[PDB]
Amino acid sequence: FVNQHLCGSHLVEALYLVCGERGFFYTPKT
């Protein structure tokens, strides 16, 4: 695997990919 820039909808898409059934949180304010 690699390291790239992941922003916006694309970042949340990658969170879905990696976390799936575990679920996740997206908190940009954090």
Residues that bind another protein in the complex, under the rule CB under 8 A: 1-8, 11, 14-15, 17-19, 22-30
| Partner from a second copy, another protein, none contacting 13, C-beta within 5 to 8 A by type | a second copy
Cα gap 2→7, rounded to integer Å: 15
**3-class secondary structure, 29:** coil
Q: Which one of a second copy, another protein, none interacts with residue 9, CB within 5 to 8 A by kind?
A: a second copy
Count of residues that interact with a second copy, criterion CB under 8 A: 28
Q: How far is CA 28 from CA 1, 6, 12, 14, in A?
A: 24, 13, 11, 15
Residue that has been written with the tokens 């390291």 in this structure: 3
Footprint of a second copy on this chain (CB under 8 A)? 1-6, 8-10, 12-30
